[PDB]
């Protein structure tokens, strides 16, 4: 299994521990990660897709060409990047007018998308190709904690193009998290948005925090010890959002936020130092005393 | 054309009569045994493959015999001599394209006993030289008489 690793922005430049965790976890599961030299912002669809669809797709196609030139598929650990590149790719394969538009612009740079790139999400790649059983085989330290699983919206949706099963009652992440020994607690409005998507975090911060607060509150009521996501954007919203909720509304939860690769990492027998948990706005130390 | 047929034609014109060619396909004249239930082909064989039964119809045995899409009159010496008909007398008066009609017939009876389940890709893959199999003597008179380049 050889895949071009799209990093994005938030993971490599801020929550770099997610990158280290993914690198090791994917190596342990028989996956070779190749560098996408020159890869830029996916670009973030919240701003780019809302500002100009033409510019979002052209820059997304530019990044798809980098993996196409290498002759490998793409793998990402972000719903934002997954949604941006997967939907960009699907559109260039399905719509000839959109492909022709983009290629006229890409021709000015010396690139041309040909439609041979497949975009994968590591959680989906783990479930469908590798197998959940292979996760459990590599568990060195079983995690005896309750996890508030946050799928995020851009992982399974739009279902018409993603084809990763139901986005209403999914089981994918619940089984991957449970392989580590953790328990995926059912909580109210489990499939709702964290509130950051569509550039809402930046434009309407209070609105985004109201939704994050609802999710955190619901997870806590369900006995969750932490939250697990598959998106640095969700991660930032749950982690930094808690500081912003404390500052604006005075509500304190001290609810640890982890990316699935970091959770998997701990179970694989990784040193929490490599996971860069000290970079998190909300300390994960209380959770480390429970695992 | 057999000598006797050439004489009959010329003799008819000498007598101010209209020449009449035989109208049927070769199976009537052929001495091979045909099944009352009809033709059913299980597999397609090249002329060198297997060992043909000298009494049973060669088409029923899986060999491409053009007798079905060829006018009678020759006496069917080829099947009688142990080899399938190559269709050298050409088609009947009711068939313009001999090869097209032969292909139609062959495709229809191929796997007819397992009609709904026979894989339709078997026959095309079995015949490596389609034009040479069905148009040895009549390519120029076919609907598509050339290879486009």
């Amino acid at each position: 299994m050889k895949y071009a690793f799209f990093l994005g922005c938030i993971m490599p430049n801020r929550y770099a521990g997610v990158e280290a965790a993914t690198r090791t976890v994917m190596e342990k599961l028989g996956v070779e990660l190749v560098d996408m030299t020159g890869a830029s912002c996916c670009p973030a669809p919240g701003v780019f897709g809302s500002f100009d669809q033409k510019t979002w797709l052209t820059l997304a196609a530019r990044n798809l060409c980098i993996a196409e030139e290498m002759g490998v598929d793409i793998v990402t650990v972000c719903n934002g990047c997954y949604g941006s590149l997967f939907e960009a790719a699907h559109l260039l394969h399905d719509n000839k007018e959109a492909l022709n538009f983009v290629n006229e612009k890409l021709d000015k740079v010396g690139k041309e998308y040909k439609g041979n790139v497949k975009v994968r999400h590591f959680a989906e790649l783990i479930y469908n190709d590798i197998g959940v059983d292979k996760i459990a085989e590599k568990v060195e330290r079983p995690l005896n904690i309750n996890v508030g699983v946050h799928y995020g919206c851009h992982f399974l949706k739009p279902t018409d193009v993603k084809h990763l099963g139901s986005a209403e009652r999914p089981v994918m992440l619940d089984e991957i998290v449970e392989a580590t020994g953790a328990k995926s607690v059912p909580y109210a409005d489990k499939m709702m948005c964290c509130g950051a998507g569509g550039g809402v975090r930046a434009r309407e911060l209070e609105l985004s925090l109201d939704m994050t607060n609802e999710k955190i509150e619901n997870m806590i009521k369900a006995g969750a010890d932490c939250t697990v996501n598959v998106c640095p954007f969700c991660h930032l919203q749950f982690d930094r959002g808690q500081i912003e909720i404390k500052e604006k509304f005075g509500k304190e939860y001290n609810f640890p936020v982890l990316h699935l690769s970091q959770l998997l990492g701990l179970a694989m027998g990784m040193d929490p130092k490599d996971l860069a948990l000290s970079v998190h706005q909300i300390s994960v130390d209380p959770l480390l005393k429970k695992i | 054309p057999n000598p006797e047929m050439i004489a009959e034609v010329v003799k008819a014109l000498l007598e101010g009569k209209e020449p009449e060619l035989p109208k049927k396909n070769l199976c009537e004249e052929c001495a091979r045994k045909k099944s009352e239930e009809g033709v059913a082909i299980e597999t397609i064989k090249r002329n060198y493959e297997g060992n043909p039964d000298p009494e049973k119809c060669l088409l029923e045995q899986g060999y491409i015999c053009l007798g079905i899409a060829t006018r009678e009159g020759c006496g069917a010496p080829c099947p009688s001599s142990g080899v399938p008909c190559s269709g050298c007398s050409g088609p009947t008066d009711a068939v313009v394209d001999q090869g097209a009609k032969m292909i139609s017939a062959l495709c229809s009876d191929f796997g007819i006993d397992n009609d709904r389940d026979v894989d339709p890709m078997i026959l095309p893959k079995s015949i490596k030289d389609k034009i040479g199999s069905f148009y040895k003597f009549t390519l120029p008179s076919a609907f598509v008489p050339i290879r486009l380049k």
């Binding site: 990093l7 780019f48 538009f101 | -």
Partner: protein, 184 residues
Amino acid sequence: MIYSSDLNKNLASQIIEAGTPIPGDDVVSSLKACYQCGTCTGSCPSGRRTSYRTRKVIRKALLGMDDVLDSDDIWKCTTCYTCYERCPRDVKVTEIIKTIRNLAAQKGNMAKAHKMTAMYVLKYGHAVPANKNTAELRKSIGLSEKAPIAQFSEKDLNEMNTLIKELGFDELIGFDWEKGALKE
């Protein structure tokens, strides 16, 4: 009171035009299949805590109320795709909202924060670029001091800068290359 003089009969067609060829004429023209059932509004996470009503956006597009382009409400959509997924008339709701946002952006209705994020992607190539603390954090956990990304490749940074100029995205956000910042 709403008069015919207060409406734009071509609003829907103008939204479809903007959505052609990306995300597609078929995709954005789906707004014409809406039968105002409200499934989108009841599914909206943002509508539960604001005055935002998803079907009113589609209603205003069909009715011709162009004030929808000046609306703060269209920017409350998180693009969760729940409306898109549940619409019984196959209206590609989330895509129509994004296309409406494109016309709102063209008219100047863009937030500084979004314009700042767009500027970081053309200048540094990334919405969240690397800082001095990144280099320190990355090397401390076994990673390369600098990630193999556009931020450190003048080749790829120039490629994007050529595309941004060809698309006119620099003019859209109001970015000047001599000044090296967002004008006005």
